[model samples]
Target chain A: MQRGKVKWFNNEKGYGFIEVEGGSDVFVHFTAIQGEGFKTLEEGQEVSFEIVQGNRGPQAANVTKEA
Target chain B: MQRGKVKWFNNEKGYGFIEVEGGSDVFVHFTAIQGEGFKTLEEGQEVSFEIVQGNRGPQAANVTKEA
Candidate 1:
């Protein structure tokens, strides 16, 4: 799993982007988060996620907050 | 802060109940959570919250997940 900071998320859109260390922005969907909460990945929350190849480009998956 | 376990919550109603340690169940409205997300909480999640005297009885306030 790679580490990244949540860039921004649109609750209305159910998706967000993450800034990966030494990499460009990665796509993250609500479905990719690994934990439960009222607030998922708030902007700037540190997280660890699996990087996967998406139809467009890099995507963040299975994201969990950095402990 | 008082420690408690989330007993159950209703997303539609935007409220839930918490079983406080050595105390009776306390009411928790979504507005009391200290963070943001879709699933405000899940049953059995450990949390710490401030207690207040609500109009009905004891209520949970300023609630945040136990780290």
Candidate 2:
């Protein structure tokens, strides 16, 4: 997997752009923040994820905290 | 895009797993950490990441931190 940080976040909406390990500025949306190992969401928070439907904007899945 | 944290990292190796923002983990490598604004990395630090090669462990790209 890859690692990146929060470029910007919409505090009201709880969403932002994460500079991925080796990809582009994906269209990251809220509601997609749910996951195991880590709860809740905040700006500049680090986590993990998988990319599904890559061609169509490419999104993340199975996302969570490292430890 | 999704967000996750780095589960674990090898300081000497500069490799680890990020708990991404949304889906499952995309294997995070060292070289992929390079970016435009951010020029370094460390463990437990927050950053943004994108997912690619869904089946290939959903790697990351364009990684960096927020101001």
Candidate 3:
């Protein structure tokens, strides 16, 4: 799992960016969140995820908030 | 201002604790957040805040998430 911090998330849009270590911000979609109920992310919230190639560029997958 | 990390927050309860530097976790209410919309804190989010005496004990005020 790669560690990163939430840069920002638009709850209404259900998309956001995650600042990964030693890399540019990675696009993150709420569907990638591993949880129940409303899926969203807060700025600066630590998270663990995997980076994968998307249609456009690098995106986050299997994102989970750090405890 | 004191720096700290969010310990945990219950969005449903609208309350949580902040792990302040060199101190026990301080009580934090959503009302104390310096934001316009739904104020909430995420686990492990960095923040700056003021510690003040609340009805029960030490609590956080003027809390703002760090950039």
Candidate 4:
């Protein structure tokens, strides 16, 4: 597993980018969040994501906030 | 993916735990924190780590702070 920081996020739009260590950025959406209470997310939050293929580009899936 | 914070760390002894989201604590040793200048670490810092098999117990690897 890899860890990254939330550079920025738009809670309403549910969009954010995870700055992975020594790698390019990865996209994250609300749909990527996992576990209950995923409906809420924000900026400056520490998070993790995976690089995966998306309709438009590579995306992070099955994302969950760090406790 | 999951996110976690640095509860505490010891730079000299080089031992820490990453409180992963919805998961148990994973031990992170000095060998775990990646990137240059890794020899220097501290407490109350936000970082990322992974769980792996270790000689003593499960360990964390390829760790980096939330930059």
Candidate 5:
């Protein structure tokens, strides 16, 4: 899993970007988040995710927040 | 404000109920949560909120999670 930090997430919009270490920011959707109950990312929160080439470009998937 | 514990929140459904102290459970919607980004409640989490008569019955508003 690739590690990154949550840049910002818009809960109402259900989308956000992740600042990958030594890489560009990647798009992230709430659906890509792993776990149950109101999936969301807080700004500056550490996370691990898989990168996939989405239709819009690189995006994060299977995201899991660091405890 | 009243104190309560989250019974269970359905993230996909965006709704849940809060088990109020010494009273009945009250309805809670994601929009009622007080915070930025994603607004959600976790099962068994403590919170503070205001009660108001909704169209159906008592509901929680201005909800804030306990730190």
Candidate 6:
């Protein structure tokens, strides 16, 4: 898994960007996020996940929050 | 430790407020944050930390961000 901070996210649309360690920005959909109760992601929030080279480019999958 | 999101932070003075798990806001100083570099915190970030009853009110100590 990669460690990074949430760059930005849209609560309504459930999509966002996570600026991963070493400076690569990856796209993450809320569908890839784990857990429940918090349907939205906040900017600057730290997260962990694996990255895959998607058709569109790099994307975050199985995203989990550290804390 | 309590879970919460960063309410706000001041990059200049190095202090901010954290909205704890239960919706109570706690004060957090940069000194209390556990890490090096990346001193400034962003709004809406999730974090975990210990809360103490301060002389004035509740304060967050050893604040660590969620993945």
Once fitted onto the true fold, the runs of candidate 2 whose alpha carbons sit more than 4 angstroms away are A1-67, B36-40
lDDT per residue as tens, model 3, A13-56: 98999987798999887756765546889999999986756446
Q: Model-by-model lDDT, in order?
A: 0.74, 0.57, 0.79, 0.63, 0.79, 0.74
Kindly report the interface RMSD of candidate 3, rounded to 1 decimal: 19.3
Q: Weakest 10 consecutive residues, lDDT, candidate 5 chain A?
A: A53-62
The digit string of per-residue lDDT tens for model 4 on B1-67 reads 2346776677778787776667678776664455546443566667765455544555555466778
| B1-67: candidate 1 lDDT, tens digit per residue | 6888999988788889998768789888775666545648778989897676544656676578887
DockQ of every candidate structure: 0.02, 0.16, 0.01, 0.02, 0.02, 0.01
Q: Which candidate is the best by DockQ?
A: 2
**Which window of 10 residues has the lowest lDDT sum in candidate 5 chain B?**
B52-61
Interface RMSD of each: 18.4, 10.1, 19.3, 14.4, 16.2, 18.4
RMSD of each: 14.9, 13.4, 15.5, 13.1, 13.1, 14.7
Report how far residue A19 has shifted in candidate 3, in Å.
Answer: 0.7
User: Given candidate 4, what's the lDDT at residue A41?
Assistant: 64
Docking class of 2: incorrect
Note the residue pairs that clash in candidate 5. Answer: none
User: Which stretches in model 3 have alpha-carbon errors above 4 Å?
Assistant: B1-67
In order, the TM-score of chain B in each prediction is: 0.88, 0.63, 0.90, 0.75, 0.91, 0.83
User: Which of 2 and 6 is ahead in lDDT?
Assistant: 6
Which residue runs does candidate 6 get wrong by more than 4 Å? B1-67
Give the share of true interchain contacts found in each model.
0.00, 0.38, 0.00, 0.00, 0.00, 0.00
Candidate 1, position B37, lDDT: 56
Least accurate 10 contiguous residues by lDDT in model 4 chain A: A48-57
Sort the candidates on TM-score, descending order. Answer: 5, 3, 1, 6, 4, 2
